[PDB]
Symmetry: D2
Subunit: 258 residues, 4 copies
């Protein structure tokens, strides 16, 4: 779809599952060269690698924990070693776990902040460093959420991580705009990743989730991957510092019932 993405090198964190996997595959369809970071050898990154190649791309995998600076550096170095450059960095890894806020253990708060916000900072930091050093007009996409604007009871750490990610992105976008580097957030609403489809199998829970979505359906991973491909492309040449919400209307509030 986007001819300019052919041959671009894109690194994606948390790409063995979910939205990261879907983005990897979509960049494959665009004939990009994808670095699939994954967290654990309990996962199946090689299946993603095969799907990216089948779709029309090239791919390698690399284990790394985005809460470890050395591992983030190694993700970037993997792009350089395997494909010779880096063009697009997608900080997608994230976690969540609900607990009443007055009871939330500090170590749970810390894990969510470290993965979701600090990890995205480190990935952004490392990619931008490389881009500035090598005069690359690179692109960073940070995977946020509707929860960068909509508060989330029982998930104060998650909300804080995404609200922080918004200002992190805006600051990096402003700081590095003169270098021709673009930095943007995607804000998904409720998406039918495997894990979410399973937890929302219960018809009552499913209906509750859908009640929050004006469009009336839970989105598919490909509908988020579409956004990432567009933002990374030169079609979005004049777009930086934004959050592009792809949420079925969730940021408007719950579905309207007359």
């Amino acid at each position: 779809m986007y001819p300019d993405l052919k041959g671009k090198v894109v690194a994606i964190t948390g790409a063995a599952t979910g939205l990261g996997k879907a983005m990897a595959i979509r960049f494959g369809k665009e004939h990009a060269k994808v670095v699939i970071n994954y967290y654990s050898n309990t996962q199946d990154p090689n299946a993603v690698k095969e799907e990216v190649i089948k779709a029309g791309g090239e791919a390698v995998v690399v284990q790394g924990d985005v809460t470890k600076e050395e591992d983030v550096k190694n993700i970037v170095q993997t792009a350089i070693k395997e494909f010779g450059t880096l063009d697009i960095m997608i900080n997608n890894a994230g976690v969540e776990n609900p607990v009443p806020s007055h009871e939330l253990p500090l170590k749970d708060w810390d894990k969510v902040i470290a993965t979701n916000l600090t990890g995205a900072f480190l990935g952004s930091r490392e990619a931008i460093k490389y881009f500035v050093e090598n005069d690359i007009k690179g692109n960073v996409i940070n995977m946020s959420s509707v929860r960068e604007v909509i508060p989330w009871p029982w998930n104060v750490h998650y909300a804080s991580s995404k609200g922080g990610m918004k200002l992190m992105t805006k600051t990096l976008a402003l700081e590095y705009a003169s270098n021709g580097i673009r930095v943007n957030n995607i804000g998904p609403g409720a998406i039918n990743t495997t894990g979410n489809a399973e937890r929302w199998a219960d018809p009552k829970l499913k209906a509750d989730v859908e009640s929050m979505i004006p469009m009336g359906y839970i989105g598919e991973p490909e509908e988020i991957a579409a956004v990432a491909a567009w933002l990374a492309s030169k079609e979005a040449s004049y777009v930086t510092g934004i959050t592009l919400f792809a949420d079925g209307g969730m940021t408007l509030g719950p579905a309207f019932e007359p």
Copy 2:
């Protein structure tokens, strides 16, 4: 680029010049059927029609003043008469004129509100009516500005019109989401439309405009047309109620100078 736009009927207000013209031409490249509304026979809508056809589309022209309800209805009827349906409505017409706010004549305020905000309401209203009557999963794009969020001294009427357009869009998006209708704003920053390129020919004024733009350049009309094509396409299937800023970073504030 977007195969699903082939054969879609798109009506664009204020399309004899500027961003409306650029959007018309881009939808031509996507093989759409374009209704080019224009304000005055002092303009050259037929040149746009020819460019849309050359680009790969079909096109007709229709005169109409978006501050006249009958004329807005006639724009929609022109789509139905000429092409048999309407799929995408783009409310692009606008005006501006700077005056210190405490001195702004009411008739100037009224003209800007009527064109920029009421006109977009009427166009949105009429398109959505048609879509609901005919079970069309249609799309409305309202042309806003960075001035839906950034205040604009000497242009209180313009700012108010765009701030209002934001809530107009969000409300229609929420109200009609269950009908499969998407409604979004585009928020351009400073763009090199012919009129702006002329007024910004003065090197000092040009530099002042550029100083407000983190990316350091004034955008081209095609960079806005790219956004409209994407939003109207099924790539943006899960996107409604947003404002997609395409502004070189202007909503981040002025360019960063260390």
Copy 3:
């Protein structure tokens, strides 16, 4: 409560009822000199005048329709004639009426825009002109709503008027900040004015209103009047261009149900 408000001249539109009345009486408690604008003498503005006086203030009444520039000018002139100056302008008059948006008559759209947005522009324009000409470090308070940020199906004209008011206020605040003039919005949520106690008399409608309010109760007019007294006072000396939401949490979304 605020010693600096004693003897300040405050003009309030729509002050014979509802929030405007409550604000008039509160400024009376602060020993201000209040210009009570009213729409019709069938509203009993003289009863408000008497309540302002009993509360500790001075007051006069003046009829005027904020959709007529001459009447807005006459409100400001009344302050000058009766009390010798103007210090605070509160643009409070407003209307609403729900209709499905694709069916909303232009007449209705126009009435809401004219009252709610253009009327506030004219009152702001006129007060600021006086303040600038006379070196008054004046204050303008525009009565907005949570609907300057929360969309409102069936009320697209109302939402547009308040979204516009946000950018009107921000623009005036920026334009006139160097003159020492402050301009701010108040954003009430659901308030138990007489008109809304009627609107929400039905127990099921009331319950539904309350369900949208995290604090769980519909506010009282005095809770809004408190905000206006503070913003007008020197306690808020460093506050301009804001919207102060007083909404029981409505902008957070509906009440949280675990």
Copy 4:
């Protein structure tokens, strides 16, 4: 000024200097019972205690580092032990340090996040727990910044911490609204605390700071303390989940130059 604050117990972090000190003294003027948390005894917290007392309040001091959960718990325990209850928690401690973002050490990132965001989470968590357990209609004030909305090149950790604080506050306000607990941010612009008078002593730096402020002056600490006293008081009974910016117009953008 606010009669309902007499005898209320307010704990304030970072209260030996700057805005925290100013808030302590202002609550003293309101005849509150103030718990002055301080970081080091080299800051002379007992001088603040004496100023609170002279102003009309009661006060105790307690050392604690808000990056240690046990110290945060001990702040809350100090209120209970010394004064018998807690009514208002003000999470004010903060740090900053500018570094180009691609060069920012993780250690520095971590310190800013831990102090500014995690520290405010822990103080909020602990106060809210107490309030819920004891049926107190308590209040939390988190000291944010204009940088919860305005990006800040070279200060990505600071901006992230405040952007996160916004969503932390909104989430807690929503989660606990039904308990009658209010949670709000204050968003100062540039304030003439001792540390910033030092930072901005240079005339050219000072002028540049002022150029970003529509009102044209750097605020004084008492102008922020005024906001905290109001938000903590029953005047703000219907106010929760907001950010009250007190910034001379900074969120509007830089001062307007025609």
